[PDB]
Amino acid sequence: MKIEEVRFGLVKIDGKEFDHDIVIYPSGRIERRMKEISKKKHGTSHKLDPEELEKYLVEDFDVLLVGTGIYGMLSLLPESKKLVEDKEVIEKPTKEALKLLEELWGKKRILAIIHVTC
């Protein structure tokens, strides 16, 4: 898991360009973020809901790291936080969040949800 570039609307990770939100699993597997799930309830994914977060509970993890957008406009709903209340949960604007992901990678098992826009 290596991060090469981070800018509004576009991140380069593992050498691939992602012009949309992504989920990075503890194993390093990368999938697109199914943000439409949160939209289909809150009119916007600006509030990541539990129905969406549950879809990412695939691999065991110690830390849930959320890149809340370059401008930190995304946030986990209280019910989402409840789902992972037994985990270490970090929510930071995206560039800082990815820099921290790079710093922490390799020790704890980290599940990361990265919002690339606001």
Side-chain angles (χ1 to χ4, degrees):
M1 196 296 289
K2 292 200 180 184
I3 299 154
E4 293 87 30
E5 282 307 311
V6 180
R7 78 188 69 242
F8 185 89
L10 189 74
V11 299
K12 186 180 168 176
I13 297 178
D14 286 5
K16 294 174 292 178
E17 298 282 6
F18 298 96
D19 73 341
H20 58 79
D21 291 7
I22 58 173
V23 176
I24 302 166
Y25 291 91
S27 62
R29 289 173 186 168
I30 301 175
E31 289 199 34
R32 66 172 290 276
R33 179 194 165 203
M34 303 194 288
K35 73 175 182 188
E36 58 278 2
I37 297 173
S38 285
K39 245 95 169 180
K40 252 110 297 300
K41 206 297 175 56
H42 303 61
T44 175
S45 296
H46 241 204
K47 299 292 179 180
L48 203 155
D49 71 25
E51 290 83 358
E52 181 188 343
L53 181 54
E54 186 274 344
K55 302 300 183 176
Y56 309 140
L57 305 182
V58 179
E59 299 178 6
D60 194 40
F61 61 98
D62 302 305
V63 179
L64 169 66
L65 180 277
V66 184
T68 57
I70 293 294
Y71 296 106
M73 301 194 182
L74 171 64
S75 67
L76 289 171
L77 282 177
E79 317 67 59
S80 297
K81 287 184 286 196
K82 184 78 175 183
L83 196 51
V84 292
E85 68 180 335
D86 61 327
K87 306 300 189 181
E88 178 171 0
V89 178
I90 308 172
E91 295 190 67
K92 299 296 169 175
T94 296
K95 191 164 290 197
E96 172 186 13
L98 285 169
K99 196 60 179 171
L100 181 64
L101 183 64
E102 175 183 80
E103 184 188 319
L104 305 175
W105 199 266
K107 279 180 171 172
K108 290 165 180 178
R109 297 169 297 178
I110 311 166
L111 171 61
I113 299 169
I114 309 296
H115 183 53
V116 305
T117 49
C118 307

PDB file of all heavy atoms in Angstrom, residues 10-34:
ATOM      1  N   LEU A  10      -8.648  13.491  -6.892  1.00  0.00           N
ATOM      2  CA  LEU A  10      -7.783  12.491  -7.498  1.00  0.00           C
ATOM      3  C   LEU A  10      -6.648  12.024  -6.606  1.00  0.00           C
ATOM      4  O   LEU A  10      -5.831  12.832  -6.156  1.00  0.00           O
ATOM      5  CB  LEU A  10      -7.183  13.070  -8.788  1.00  0.00           C
ATOM      6  CG  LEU A  10      -6.414  12.119  -9.710  1.00  0.00           C
ATOM      7  CD1 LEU A  10      -7.398  11.207 -10.446  1.00  0.00           C
ATOM      8  CD2 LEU A  10      -5.593  12.920 -10.710  1.00  0.00           C
ATOM      9  N   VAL A  11      -6.596  10.723  -6.347  1.00  0.00           N
ATOM     10  CA  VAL A  11      -5.501  10.178  -5.558  1.00  0.00           C
ATOM     11  C   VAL A  11      -4.826   9.058  -6.344  1.00  0.00           C
ATOM     12  O   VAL A  11      -5.492   8.313  -7.066  1.00  0.00           O
ATOM     13  CB  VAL A  11      -5.971   9.640  -4.182  1.00  0.00           C
ATOM     14  CG1 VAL A  11      -6.576  10.785  -3.369  1.00  0.00           C
ATOM     15  CG2 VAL A  11      -6.955   8.495  -4.359  1.00  0.00           C
ATOM     16  N   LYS A  12      -3.499   8.975  -6.241  1.00  0.00           N
ATOM     17  CA  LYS A  12      -2.729   7.937  -6.929  1.00  0.00           C
ATOM     18  C   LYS A  12      -2.205   7.025  -5.829  1.00  0.00           C
ATOM     19  O   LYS A  12      -1.409   7.449  -4.989  1.00  0.00           O
ATOM     20  CB  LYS A  12      -1.560   8.530  -7.721  1.00  0.00           C
ATOM     21  CG  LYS A  12      -0.823   7.495  -8.573  1.00  0.00           C
ATOM     22  CD  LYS A  12       0.324   8.126  -9.340  1.00  0.00           C
ATOM     23  CE  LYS A  12       1.233   7.072  -9.951  1.00  0.00           C
ATOM     24  NZ  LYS A  12       2.290   7.743 -10.766  1.00  0.00           N
ATOM     25  N   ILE A  13      -2.681   5.785  -5.828  1.00  0.00           N
ATOM     26  CA  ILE A  13      -2.307   4.809  -4.817  1.00  0.00           C
ATOM     27  C   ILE A  13      -1.993   3.489  -5.519  1.00  0.00           C
ATOM     28  O   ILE A  13      -2.740   3.062  -6.405  1.00  0.00           O
ATOM     29  CB  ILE A  13      -3.466   4.649  -3.800  1.00  0.00           C
ATOM     30  CG1 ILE A  13      -3.681   5.984  -3.076  1.00  0.00           C
ATOM     31  CG2 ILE A  13      -3.155   3.530  -2.811  1.00  0.00           C
ATOM     32  CD1 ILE A  13      -4.826   5.986  -2.071  1.00  0.00           C
ATOM     33  N   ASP A  14      -0.884   2.857  -5.126  1.00  0.00           N
ATOM     34  CA  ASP A  14      -0.431   1.608  -5.740  1.00  0.00           C
ATOM     35  C   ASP A  14      -0.214   1.831  -7.234  1.00  0.00           C
ATOM     36  O   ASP A  14      -0.328   0.902  -8.047  1.00  0.00           O
ATOM     37  CB  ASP A  14      -1.438   0.474  -5.518  1.00  0.00           C
ATOM     38  CG  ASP A  14      -1.422  -0.055  -4.101  1.00  0.00           C
ATOM     39  OD1 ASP A  14      -0.706   0.511  -3.247  1.00  0.00           O
ATOM     40  OD2 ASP A  14      -2.136  -1.052  -3.840  1.00  0.00           O
ATOM     41  N   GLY A  15       0.084   3.081  -7.581  1.00  0.00           N
ATOM     42  CA  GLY A  15       0.353   3.448  -8.964  1.00  0.00           C
ATOM     43  C   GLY A  15      -0.855   3.687  -9.841  1.00  0.00           C
ATOM     44  O   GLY A  15      -0.715   4.030 -11.021  1.00  0.00           O
ATOM     45  N   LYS A  16      -2.040   3.519  -9.270  1.00  0.00           N
ATOM     46  CA  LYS A  16      -3.281   3.696 -10.013  1.00  0.00           C
ATOM     47  C   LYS A  16      -3.977   4.997  -9.637  1.00  0.00           C
ATOM     48  O   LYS A  16      -3.956   5.400  -8.482  1.00  0.00           O
ATOM     49  CB  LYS A  16      -4.210   2.511  -9.743  1.00  0.00           C
ATOM     50  CG  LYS A  16      -3.677   1.183 -10.279  1.00  0.00           C
ATOM     51  CD  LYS A  16      -4.546  -0.006  -9.875  1.00  0.00           C
ATOM     52  CE  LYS A  16      -4.477  -0.262  -8.375  1.00  0.00           C
ATOM     53  NZ  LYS A  16      -5.351  -1.396  -7.949  1.00  0.00           N
ATOM     54  N   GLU A  17      -4.581   5.661 -10.620  1.00  0.00           N
ATOM     55  CA  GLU A  17      -5.292   6.918 -10.386  1.00  0.00           C
ATOM     56  C   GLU A  17      -6.757   6.667 -10.080  1.00  0.00           C
ATOM     57  O   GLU A  17      -7.455   6.024 -10.855  1.00  0.00           O
ATOM     58  CB  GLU A  17      -5.224   7.818 -11.619  1.00  0.00           C
ATOM     59  CG  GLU A  17      -3.835   8.240 -12.018  1.00  0.00           C
ATOM     60  CD  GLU A  17      -3.303   9.345 -11.149  1.00  0.00           C
ATOM     61  OE1 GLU A  17      -3.982   9.706 -10.164  1.00  0.00           O
ATOM     62  OE2 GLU A  17      -2.205   9.856 -11.456  1.00  0.00           O
ATOM     63  N   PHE A  18      -7.219   7.181  -8.945  1.00  0.00           N
ATOM     64  CA  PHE A  18      -8.614   7.042  -8.540  1.00  0.00           C
ATOM     65  C   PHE A  18      -9.245   8.428  -8.517  1.00  0.00           C
ATOM     66  O   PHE A  18      -8.854   9.268  -7.699  1.00  0.00           O
ATOM     67  CB  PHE A  18      -8.690   6.412  -7.146  1.00  0.00           C
ATOM     68  CG  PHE A  18      -8.109   5.027  -7.082  1.00  0.00           C
ATOM     69  CD1 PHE A  18      -6.802   4.835  -6.663  1.00  0.00           C
ATOM     70  CD2 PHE A  18      -8.864   3.924  -7.458  1.00  0.00           C
ATOM     71  CE1 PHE A  18      -6.250   3.565  -6.615  1.00  0.00           C
ATOM     72  CE2 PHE A  18      -8.325   2.648  -7.414  1.00  0.00           C
ATOM     73  CZ  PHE A  18      -7.009   2.468  -6.992  1.00  0.00           C
ATOM     74  N   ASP A  19     -10.208   8.676  -9.411  1.00  0.00           N
ATOM     75  CA  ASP A  19     -10.876   9.977  -9.478  1.00  0.00           C
ATOM     76  C   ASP A  19     -12.205   9.944  -8.738  1.00  0.00           C
ATOM     77  O   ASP A  19     -13.138  10.698  -9.049  1.00  0.00           O
ATOM     78  CB  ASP A  19     -11.111  10.395 -10.939  1.00  0.00           C
ATOM     79  CG  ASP A  19     -12.225   9.607 -11.618  1.00  0.00           C
ATOM     80  OD1 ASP A  19     -12.600   8.510 -11.152  1.00  0.00           O
ATOM     81  OD2 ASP A  19     -12.729  10.095 -12.650  1.00  0.00           O
ATOM     82  N   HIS A  20     -12.262   9.086  -7.724  1.00  0.00           N
ATOM     83  CA  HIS A  20     -13.473   8.886  -6.949  1.00  0.00           C
ATOM     84  C   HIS A  20     -13.108   8.293  -5.592  1.00  0.00           C
ATOM     85  O   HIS A  20     -11.961   7.887  -5.365  1.00  0.00           O
ATOM     86  CB  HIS A  20     -14.390   7.923  -7.707  1.00  0.00           C
ATOM     87  CG  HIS A  20     -13.758   6.596  -7.988  1.00  0.00           C
ATOM     88  ND1 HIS A  20     -13.662   5.607  -7.032  1.00  0.00           N
ATOM     89  CD2 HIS A  20     -13.160   6.105  -9.099  1.00  0.00           C
ATOM     90  CE1 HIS A  20     -13.030   4.565  -7.542  1.00  0.00           C
ATOM     91  NE2 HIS A  20     -12.714   4.840  -8.795  1.00  0.00           N
ATOM     92  N   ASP A  21     -14.091   8.230  -4.702  1.00  0.00           N
ATOM     93  CA  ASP A  21     -13.880   7.706  -3.361  1.00  0.00           C
ATOM     94  C   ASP A  21     -13.513   6.228  -3.371  1.00  0.00           C
ATOM     95  O   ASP A  21     -13.978   5.462  -4.223  1.00  0.00           O
ATOM     96  CB  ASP A  21     -15.141   7.908  -2.524  1.00  0.00           C
ATOM     97  CG  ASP A  21     -15.416   9.365  -2.211  1.00  0.00           C
ATOM     98  OD1 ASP A  21     -14.718  10.262  -2.730  1.00  0.00           O
ATOM     99  OD2 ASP A  21     -16.353   9.613  -1.435  1.00  0.00           O
ATOM    100  N   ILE A  22     -12.706   5.828  -2.399  1.00  0.00           N
ATOM    101  CA  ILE A  22     -12.269   4.444  -2.297  1.00  0.00           C
ATOM    102  C   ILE A  22     -12.230   3.947  -0.865  1.00  0.00           C
ATOM    103  O   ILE A  22     -12.258   4.730   0.091  1.00  0.00           O
ATOM    104  CB  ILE A  22     -10.842   4.233  -2.895  1.00  0.00           C
ATOM    105  CG1 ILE A  22      -9.818   5.131  -2.187  1.00  0.00           C
ATOM    106  CG2 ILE A  22     -10.862   4.515  -4.398  1.00  0.00           C
ATOM    107  CD1 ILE A  22      -8.369   4.862  -2.606  1.00  0.00           C
ATOM    108  N   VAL A  23     -12.186   2.624  -0.750  1.00  0.00           N
ATOM    109  CA  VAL A  23     -12.073   1.928   0.516  1.00  0.00           C
ATOM    110  C   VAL A  23     -10.802   1.083   0.406  1.00  0.00           C
ATOM    111  O   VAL A  23     -10.616   0.344  -0.563  1.00  0.00           O
ATOM    112  CB  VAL A  23     -13.289   1.008   0.776  1.00  0.00           C
ATOM    113  CG1 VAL A  23     -13.097   0.226   2.071  1.00  0.00           C
ATOM    114  CG2 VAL A  23     -14.549   1.845   0.859  1.00  0.00           C
ATOM    115  N   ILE A  24      -9.903   1.242   1.370  1.00  0.00           N
ATOM    116  CA  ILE A  24      -8.667   0.478   1.397  1.00  0.00           C
ATOM    117  C   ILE A  24      -8.792  -0.464   2.590  1.00  0.00           C
ATOM    118  O   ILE A  24      -8.901  -0.019   3.740  1.00  0.00           O
ATOM    119  CB  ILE A  24      -7.433   1.383   1.588  1.00  0.00           C
ATOM    120  CG1 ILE A  24      -7.367   2.421   0.460  1.00  0.00           C
ATOM    121  CG2 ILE A  24      -6.170   0.532   1.617  1.00  0.00           C
ATOM    122  CD1 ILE A  24      -6.387   3.566   0.720  1.00  0.00           C
ATOM    123  N   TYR A  25      -8.819  -1.761   2.308  1.00  0.00           N
ATOM    124  CA  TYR A  25      -8.928  -2.776   3.346  1.00  0.00           C
ATOM    125  C   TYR A  25      -7.582  -3.041   4.009  1.00  0.00           C
ATOM    126  O   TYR A  25      -6.536  -2.726   3.452  1.00  0.00           O
ATOM    127  CB  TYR A  25      -9.494  -4.054   2.727  1.00  0.00           C
ATOM    128  CG  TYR A  25     -10.934  -3.869   2.325  1.00  0.00           C
ATOM    129  CD1 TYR A  25     -11.282  -3.430   1.044  1.00  0.00           C
ATOM    130  CD2 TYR A  25     -11.951  -4.041   3.261  1.00  0.00           C
ATOM    131  CE1 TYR A  25     -12.621  -3.158   0.719  1.00  0.00           C
ATOM    132  CE2 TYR A  25     -13.270  -3.780   2.950  1.00  0.00           C
ATOM    133  CZ  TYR A  25     -13.604  -3.339   1.690  1.00  0.00           C
ATOM    134  OH  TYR A  25     -14.929  -3.076   1.422  1.00  0.00           O
ATOM    135  N   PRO A  26      -7.591  -3.621   5.223  1.00  0.00           N
ATOM    136  CA  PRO A  26      -6.356  -3.924   5.959  1.00  0.00           C
ATOM    137  C   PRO A  26      -5.299  -4.666   5.150  1.00  0.00           C
ATOM    138  O   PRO A  26      -4.101  -4.455   5.353  1.00  0.00           O
ATOM    139  CB  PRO A  26      -6.853  -4.757   7.142  1.00  0.00           C
ATOM    140  CG  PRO A  26      -8.185  -4.167   7.414  1.00  0.00           C
ATOM    141  CD  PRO A  26      -8.776  -3.949   6.036  1.00  0.00           C
ATOM    142  N   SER A  27      -5.752  -5.542   4.257  1.00  0.00           N
ATOM    143  CA  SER A  27      -4.872  -6.335   3.399  1.00  0.00           C
ATOM    144  C   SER A  27      -4.271  -5.526   2.269  1.00  0.00           C
ATOM    145  O   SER A  27      -3.369  -6.000   1.586  1.00  0.00           O
ATOM    146  CB  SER A  27      -5.650  -7.486   2.762  1.00  0.00           C
ATOM    147  OG  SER A  27      -6.687  -6.976   1.929  1.00  0.00           O
ATOM    148  N   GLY A  28      -4.790  -4.324   2.044  1.00  0.00           N
ATOM    149  CA  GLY A  28      -4.277  -3.518   0.952  1.00  0.00           C
ATOM    150  C   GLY A  28      -5.174  -3.591  -0.271  1.00  0.00           C
ATOM    151  O   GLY A  28      -4.917  -2.921  -1.269  1.00  0.00           O
ATOM    152  N   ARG A  29      -6.214  -4.421  -0.216  1.00  0.00           N
ATOM    153  CA  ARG A  29      -7.151  -4.505  -1.333  1.00  0.00           C
ATOM    154  C   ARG A  29      -7.872  -3.161  -1.401  1.00  0.00           C
ATOM    155  O   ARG A  29      -8.184  -2.560  -0.370  1.00  0.00           O
ATOM    156  CB  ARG A  29      -8.166  -5.620  -1.099  1.00  0.00           C
ATOM    157  CG  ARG A  29      -7.571  -7.006  -1.226  1.00  0.00           C
ATOM    158  CD  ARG A  29      -8.559  -8.076  -0.818  1.00  0.00           C
ATOM    159  NE  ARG A  29      -7.921  -9.386  -0.813  1.00  0.00           N
ATOM    160  CZ  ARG A  29      -8.463 -10.482  -0.289  1.00  0.00           C
ATOM    161  NH1 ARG A  29      -9.662 -10.429   0.274  1.00  0.00           N
ATOM    162  NH2 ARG A  29      -7.799 -11.629  -0.326  1.00  0.00           N
ATOM    163  N   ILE A  30      -8.124  -2.688  -2.614  1.00  0.00           N
ATOM    164  CA  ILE A  30      -8.808  -1.415  -2.811  1.00  0.00           C
ATOM    165  C   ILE A  30     -10.095  -1.619  -3.601  1.00  0.00           C
ATOM    166  O   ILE A  30     -10.111  -2.341  -4.601  1.00  0.00           O
ATOM    167  CB  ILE A  30      -7.922  -0.411  -3.586  1.00  0.00           C
ATOM    168  CG1 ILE A  30      -6.617  -0.163  -2.826  1.00  0.00           C
ATOM    169  CG2 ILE A  30      -8.677   0.901  -3.790  1.00  0.00           C
ATOM    170  CD1 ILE A  30      -5.640   0.723  -3.578  1.00  0.00           C
ATOM    171  N   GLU A  31     -11.175  -0.999  -3.138  1.00  0.00           N
ATOM    172  CA  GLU A  31     -12.463  -1.074  -3.823  1.00  0.00           C
ATOM    173  C   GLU A  31     -13.061   0.320  -3.897  1.00  0.00           C
ATOM    174  O   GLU A  31     -12.681   1.220  -3.143  1.00  0.00           O
ATOM    175  CB  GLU A  31     -13.464  -1.948  -3.069  1.00  0.00           C
ATOM    176  CG  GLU A  31     -13.203  -3.435  -3.074  1.00  0.00           C
ATOM    177  CD  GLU A  31     -14.462  -4.204  -2.719  1.00  0.00           C
ATOM    178  OE1 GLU A  31     -15.558  -3.733  -3.089  1.00  0.00           O
ATOM    179  OE2 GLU A  31     -14.365  -5.276  -2.088  1.00  0.00           O
ATOM    180  N   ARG A  32     -14.019   0.503  -4.795  1.00  0.00           N
ATOM    181  CA  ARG A  32     -14.665   1.795  -4.897  1.00  0.00           C
ATOM    182  C   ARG A  32     -15.579   1.960  -3.679  1.00  0.00           C
ATOM    183  O   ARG A  32     -16.108   0.982  -3.139  1.00  0.00           O
ATOM    184  CB  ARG A  32     -15.490   1.887  -6.188  1.00  0.00           C
ATOM    185  CG  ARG A  32     -16.683   0.950  -6.245  1.00  0.00           C
ATOM    186  CD  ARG A  32     -17.558   1.235  -7.469  1.00  0.00           C
ATOM    187  NE  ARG A  32     -18.269   2.502  -7.343  1.00  0.00           N
ATOM    188  CZ  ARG A  32     -19.420   2.660  -6.694  1.00  0.00           C
ATOM    189  NH1 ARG A  32     -20.017   1.629  -6.106  1.00  0.00           N
ATOM    190  NH2 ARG A  32     -19.972   3.862  -6.624  1.00  0.00           N
ATOM    191  N   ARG A  33     -15.735   3.194  -3.222  1.00  0.00           N
ATOM    192  CA  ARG A  33     -16.621   3.449  -2.106  1.00  0.00           C
ATOM    193  C   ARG A  33     -18.056   3.430  -2.640  1.00  0.00           C
ATOM    194  O   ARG A  33     -18.352   4.074  -3.656  1.00  0.00           O
ATOM    195  CB  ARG A  33     -16.331   4.819  -1.485  1.00  0.00           C
ATOM    196  CG  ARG A  33     -17.256   5.150  -0.331  1.00  0.00           C
ATOM    197  CD  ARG A  33     -17.213   6.608   0.088  1.00  0.00           C
ATOM    198  NE  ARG A  33     -18.377   6.872   0.930  1.00  0.00           N
ATOM    199  CZ  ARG A  33     -18.928   8.064   1.124  1.00  0.00           C
ATOM    200  NH1 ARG A  33     -18.426   9.148   0.546  1.00  0.00           N
ATOM    201  NH2 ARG A  33     -20.023   8.157   1.861  1.00  0.00           N
ATOM    202  N   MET A  34     -18.947   2.697  -1.975  1.00  0.00           N
ATOM    203  CA  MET A  34     -20.333   2.632  -2.429  1.00  0.00           C
ATOM    204  C   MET A  34     -21.103   3.758  -1.746  1.00  0.00           C
ATOM    205  O   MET A  34     -22.041   3.545  -0.975  1.00  0.00           O
ATOM    206  CB  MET A  34     -20.962   1.290  -2.053  1.00  0.00           C
ATOM    207  CG  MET A  34     -20.171   0.129  -2.617  1.00  0.00           C
ATOM    208  SD  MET A  34     -21.084  -1.422  -2.528  1.00  0.00           S
ATOM    209  CE  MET A  34     -21.026  -1.710  -0.837  1.00  0.00           C
TER     210      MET A  34
END
